[PDB]
């Protein structure tokens, strides 16, 4: 055969797409607590 | 800060800051290749008007 | 020649070239990773149409995503001059969700405000070309409009969302389409009979990575510094010919904030941040007998004519104390953008930065509202005494006054752009802070 | 899709992506210091008014200062088209004094020249909105103008002036207000009856630093590489309709200079760097019967129509030797800015850079005039043969000529921008070189 393989028109062995879970894992909860009252936090405890 | 600062006084603007130094090392290109030369008897010839036999 | 400059070297050259560190004449480019980019069409769930809510899940075709462009096909319900950025008006809002958690949300008005502040020059014009008709197209004309999104990962490759590292979480976009778009299906308040419903498609630009980089993204945890938009709509302490209205708006913002932005507007006229007037471009029919100052020249809704703006002055207080001296509305309109962005901001749109350069991605000073008990935006309005139908009154007046038609700018939109952290770990993610 | 490109890889790619160093898909942001910025009003000393000299002392409210904006409130003395960047005209000059030493100084004409060369696009447009009336305002209109200052510390935080490190030294701004502002209190040579005096306020944007950063600035010595403006006025070798005027000016300049800049002007009209003509925008009423080539269309004083400029060609000679071959005036007007700035310079304004990027902060080549005895700017002028009242005469003419009205551009302003060092130590500052 006169022409050797030029190498053009290549391919990539075992190309998998990005993993897509079907289970649809639960959303991650936050790390910062809810900004409640800024100056009167955690009750007052009124006396008699 | 107010008196020890260097000012562009006379003597620093002298023309010898340029005229005394040559512009040869700033424009010349490095060669490191030998130049040629050949004898005059090599280009002109041998002058065929010599003797006959 | 140039040689005389090189030779005459002195003491003052030492601080510029002595013990030199760099050159300018030989750039070594950094070798980068092997990657490729592709624009892939998404499937939209729900029916697209005016007033509808639709959504899409971003397909896991590539490893990372950046740019997202929403395509629309709109038609003209009237002639040139009847529409104003209609594709932007149509996309009422977009919400970004990861794993079911809200990450961010943009509004049509935000897109308009954002554009007004951060795009510029031919970027701004090219943008306008993608959302409006700008070559005097006529009724019945059809055009495809591209609305790029402005979520944090849509601005730089540096924040490309690692879909590859989210193996257990879905990523979605929720898009609200406006019930009406000026010059497309409605003209002012009047419906346009026969108006077509928009065609819509969402395109996501994916990055395909080579083996080593894909592996690292899929396996390693990541923390991406992202921007978020906070937004609340408010009633404006509408000014009047008889008074300088004022208002104190407690600012319900949180997180390290780069900047606040706001505008006053006409609730029924998209993009109208200024009063209408009988001066060229400032109203329908301006300059002639038919001029009316109750309806805008829609194609020319935007303006730099501050006289028609309504903010006399403003200050922001933190914990009840002044954060800076009270400045004129024109400060927040012209100077803040000059300093912080470098473009030109349309009248009626204001910016206040807490950052040196909020326009970029790198933090450059922030105001953390999660540590400020009582932040307030205090506004003073201009007096609406100018007879808008008379150029002599409109173009020749004083600093503290505006158009009688400025009382139509009853809506106030206050935005804040802040930082947060998006954490991706073991295939799942969400944000570090709620507030 | 995209995979088809990734696979398209071979030896030619190695130089671009082999042993990769970077990516574009993950940014590391750099943790920065803790600071805040506040806009604080300074008190103006003296008496504000046209032609008056006032001054202000910068208060020690914050630790560092950068941007300075001078507010002015003016009222139109005539209709739209009668003013040209009037807030710029008003701020005749500003001098920067630190520790009693003159550090720098700007002039209204510099603000105009600087703008003409270095601002651009919507920066320039937004910039005009802050110094002029650009929405066809009418007589009596009142506007607050914001004139940013352009001293080294007013352009970048990198050179914020560390007032904190200057505990012993005052930083002052001395301002001269113009005796007249076109379209505000005067119309050409005529005074405008009823014109209001200006209201002025100086705002300084101060940076508040946290403890560690503030302490370092307060205690450590600093060397800030800053830029300064040098400026001298000269009489122009006034153009003539009969020949080509020429001039050779020894420039009394010093220091490593990033660039020279200059213009020719009619001192009567702020910003007029070109000849007047009966072509649209080139004179008051240009294009019609009422056109006068003795007065500019003030709102359109500046133009890109080089026909009305007067410089034919120029060169800079240093100690008797040419620094570069003589180039045409349009080189200095169009090419220099193309190459060095990336903006668009108005006719009549010229630039010659010694720097690769003169518009930036980082030194990129300078000409040190402190080592040059005879720095001479050689100027060749155009012949003012064109009858300015005939638009055909102007618009259809040749390269080497200009308008007969170009002979009115009798003033020459030559600027130079250099680098110096502002040394700060033990609570005091001053310049390393004079």
Swiss-Prot record, chain A:
<comment type="function">
    <text>One of the minor capsid proteins that constitute a network internal to the major capsid proteins and outside the lipid membrane. The minor capsid proteins glue and stabilize the capsomers. Also acts as a molecular tape measure protein that determines the size of the viral capsid.</text>
</comment>
<protein>
    <recommendedName>
        <fullName>Minor capsid protein P2</fullName>
    </recommendedName>
</protein>
<comment type="subunit">
    <text>Interacts with the major capsid protein.</text>
</comment>
UniProtKB/Swiss-Prot annotation, chain B:
<protein>
    <recommendedName>
        <fullName>Minor capsid protein 3</fullName>
    </recommendedName>
</protein>
<comment type="function">
    <text>One of the minor capsid proteins that constitute a network internal to the major capsid proteins and outside the lipid membrane. The minor capsid proteins glue and stabilize the capsomers.</text>
</comment>
<comment type="subunit">
    <text>Interacts with the major capsid protein.</text>
</comment>
From Swiss-Prot, chain C:
<dbReference type="InterPro" id="IPR031654">
    <property type="entry name" value="Capsid_N"/>
</dbReference>
<dbReference type="GO" id="GO:0005198">
    <property type="term" value="F:structural molecule activity"/>
</dbReference>
<feature type="glycosylation site" description="N-linked (Glc...) asparagine; by host">
    <location>
        <position position="404"/>
    </location>
</feature>
<feature type="glycosylation site" description="N-linked (Glc...) asparagine; by host">
    <location>
        <position position="300"/>
    </location>
</feature>
<keyword id="KW-0325">Glycoprotein</keyword>
<dbReference type="Pfam" id="PF04451">
    <property type="entry name" value="Capsid_NCLDV"/>
</dbReference>
<protein>
    <recommendedName>
        <fullName>Major capsid protein</fullName>
    </recommendedName>
</protein>
<dbReference type="InterPro" id="IPR038519">
    <property type="entry name" value="MCP_C_sf"/>
</dbReference>
<comment type="function">
    <text>Major capsid protein self-assembles to form an icosahedral capsid with a pseudo T=169 symmetry, about 190 nm in diameter, and consisting of 1680 major capsid proteins trimers. The capsid consists in 5040 copies of the major capsid protein (hexamers), 60 copies of the penton protein (pentamers) and 1800 minor capsid proteins of different types. The minor capsid proteins form a hexagonal network below the outer capsid shell, stabilizing the capsid by binding neighboring capsomers together.</text>
</comment>
<dbReference type="InterPro" id="IPR007542">
    <property type="entry name" value="MCP_C"/>
</dbReference>
<dbReference type="GO" id="GO:0019028">
    <property type="term" value="C:viral capsid"/>
</dbReference>
<dbReference type="GO" id="GO:0008289">
    <property type="term" value="F:lipid binding"/>
</dbReference>
Curated annotation (Swiss-Prot), chain D:
<keyword id="KW-0167">Capsid protein</keyword>
<protein>
    <recommendedName>
        <fullName>Major capsid protein</fullName>
    </recommendedName>
</protein>
<dbReference type="InterPro" id="IPR016112">
    <property type="entry name" value="VP_dsDNA_II"/>
</dbReference>
<feature type="glycosylation site" description="N-linked (Glc...) asparagine; by host">
    <location>
        <position position="404"/>
    </location>
</feature>
<comment type="similarity">
    <text>Belongs to the NCLDV major capsid protein family.</text>
</comment>
<feature type="glycosylation site" description="N-linked (Glc...) asparagine; by host">
    <location>
        <position position="397"/>
    </location>
</feature>
<dbReference type="GO" id="GO:0019028">
    <property type="term" value="C:viral capsid"/>
</dbReference>
<dbReference type="GO" id="GO:0005198">
    <property type="term" value="F:structural molecule activity"/>
</dbReference>
<dbReference type="Pfam" id="PF16903">
    <property type="entry name" value="Capsid_N"/>
</dbReference>
<keyword id="KW-0946">Virion</keyword>
<dbReference type="GO" id="GO:0008289">
    <property type="term" value="F:lipid binding"/>
</dbReference>
<keyword id="KW-0426">Late protein</keyword>
């Amino acid at each position: 055969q006169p022409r050797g393989y030029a190498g053009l028109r290549p391919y990539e062995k075992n190309y998998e797409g990005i993993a897509e879970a079907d289970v649809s894992a639960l959303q991650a909860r936050y790390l910062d607590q809810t900004r409640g009252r800024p100056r009167t936090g955690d009750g007052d405890t009124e006396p008699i | 800060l107010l008196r020890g600062f260097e000012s562009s006084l006379r003597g620093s603007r002298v023309r010898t800051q340029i005229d005394d130094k040559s512009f040869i090392p700033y424009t010349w290109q490095m060669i490191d290749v030998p130049l040629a030369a050949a004898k005059t008897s090599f280009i002109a010839g041998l002058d065929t008007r010599q003797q006959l036999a | 020649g140039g040689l005389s400059q090189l030779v005459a070297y002195g003491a003052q050259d030492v601080y510029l070239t002595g013990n030199p560190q760099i050159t300018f004449f030989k750039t070594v480019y950094r070798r980068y990773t092997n990657f490729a980019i592709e624009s892939i069409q998404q499937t939209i769930n729900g029916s697209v149409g005016f007033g509808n809510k639709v959504s899409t899940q971003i397909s896991r075709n590539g490893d990372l995503i950046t740019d997202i462009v929403v395509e629309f096909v709109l038609t003209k319900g009237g002639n040139g001059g009847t529409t104003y950025y209609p594709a932007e008006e149509l996309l009422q809002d977009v919400e970004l969700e990861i794993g079911g958690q809200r990450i961010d949300k943009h509004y049509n008005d935000w897109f308009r405000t954002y554009d007004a502040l951060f795009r510029m020059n031919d970027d701004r014009y090219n943008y306008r070309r993608m959302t409006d008709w700008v070559n005097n197209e006529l009724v019945g004309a059809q055009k495809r409009f591209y609305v790029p999104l402005i979520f944090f990962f849509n601005q730089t490759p540096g924040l490309a969302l690692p879909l590859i590292a989210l193996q257990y979480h879905e990523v979605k976009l929720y898009f609200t389409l406006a019930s009406q778009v000026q010059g497309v299906n409605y003209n002012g308040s009047s419906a346009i009979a026969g108006a077509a419903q928009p065609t819509m498609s969402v395109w996501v630009d994916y990055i395909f990575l080579d083996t080593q980089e894909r592996t690292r993204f899929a396996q390693l945890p990541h923390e991406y510094l992202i921007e978020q938009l906070q937004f609340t709509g408010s009633e404006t302490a509408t000014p009047s010919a008889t008074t300088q209205a004022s208002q104190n708006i407690r600012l319900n913002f949180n997180h390290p904030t780069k900047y606040l932005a706001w505008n006053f507007n006409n609730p029924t006229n998209y993009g109208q941040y200024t009063a209408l007037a009988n001066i060229p471009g400032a109203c329908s029919g301006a300059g002639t007998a038919a001029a009316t100052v109750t309806t805008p020249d829609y194609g020319n809704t935007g303006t730099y004519n501050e006289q028609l703006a309504v903010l006399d002055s403003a200050k922001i207080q933190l914990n009840g104390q002044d954060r800076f001296a009270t400045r004129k509305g024109s400060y927040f309109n012209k100077v803040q953008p000059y300093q912080s962005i470098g473009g030109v901001t349309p009248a009626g749109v204001y910016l206040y930065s807490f950052a040196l350069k909020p326009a970029g991605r790198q933090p450059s000073g922030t105001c953390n509202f999660s540590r400020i008990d009582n932040a307030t935006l205090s506004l003073t309005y201009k007096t609406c005494s100018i007879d808008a139908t008379s150029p002599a009154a409109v173009l020749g007046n004083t600093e503290t006054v505006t158009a009688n038609t400025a009382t139509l700018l009853t809506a106030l939109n206050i935005y804040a752009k802040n930082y947060n952290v998006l954490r991706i770990m073991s295939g799942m993610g969400g944000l570090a802070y709620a507030n």
